Amino acid sequence: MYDRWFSQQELQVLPFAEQDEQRNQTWLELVGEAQQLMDERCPADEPRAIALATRWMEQLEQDTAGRPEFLTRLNEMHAAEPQMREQTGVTPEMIDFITRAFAESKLAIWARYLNDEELAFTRQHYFDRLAEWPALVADLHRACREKRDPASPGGQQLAQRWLALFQSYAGKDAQTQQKFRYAMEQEPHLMKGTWMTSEVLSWLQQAIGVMM
């Protein structure tokens, strides 16, 4: 199944391919527990749901080798592979539940940095363009590997896309955006589930610097 979507060279470095049992048992537990919460009508802002969603993103980043290009590949499979549902037990409805629960874990943090109106805006618009982040993070990793110049046209285009996705949920207000960047500096959890590394983040912030 994975062969239809990953090269055999990629399958060597893709933890999903190896037979480990602790890795399989870990996902049997995470999926079984997600379906149980959904059966119980558990809301996404429930501590159990939030805790599960965080563990879900931690494990998913580990088992993609921190490679966002593999994350984007799995999302291609969930949309295009009919076997994904039966093979993994992960449904599109389940992903929507985990996505909302993980977002709630960050909104719980942002509520300390934002006012009631700012938070209300972000809670509504956080999901507008959320699914486009993995494709951007993969291009950022690529630009970093290839030693692309942040000031080059291509590098500024990546900075522009980051700004587009960031303003989507933070808004255009300069003061409000400052709060987000300050929270990002103080809260390590806010950088979970991003596939971002200090090296890429450093490349991104040079590109944003030139854009200013």
Ligand X SMILES: COc1c(NC(=O)c2ccc(NC(=O)c3ccc(N4C(=O)C[C@H](NC(=O)c5ccc(NC(=O)/C(C)=C/c6ccc(O)cc6)cc5)C4=O)cc3)c(OC)c2O)ccc(C(=O)O)c1O
Q: Which residues bind ligand X (CB under 6 A)?
A: 16, 24, 27, 31, 60, 71, 74-75, 88, 90, 95, 98-99, 130-131, 133-134, 137, 166, 180-181, 184, 193-196, 205
Nearest-approach distance from CB 205 to ligand X, in angstroms: 5
Nearest-approach distance from CB 106 to ligand X, in angstroms: 8
CA distances from residue 83 to 63, 88, 96 in whole angstroms, order as listed: 20, 8, 19
CB nearer to ligand X: give 156 or 194. Answer: 194
CB nearer to ligand X: give 52 or 60. Answer: 60
Nearest-approach distance from CB 180 to ligand X, in angstroms: 5
Nearest-approach distance from CB 73 to ligand X, in angstroms: 9
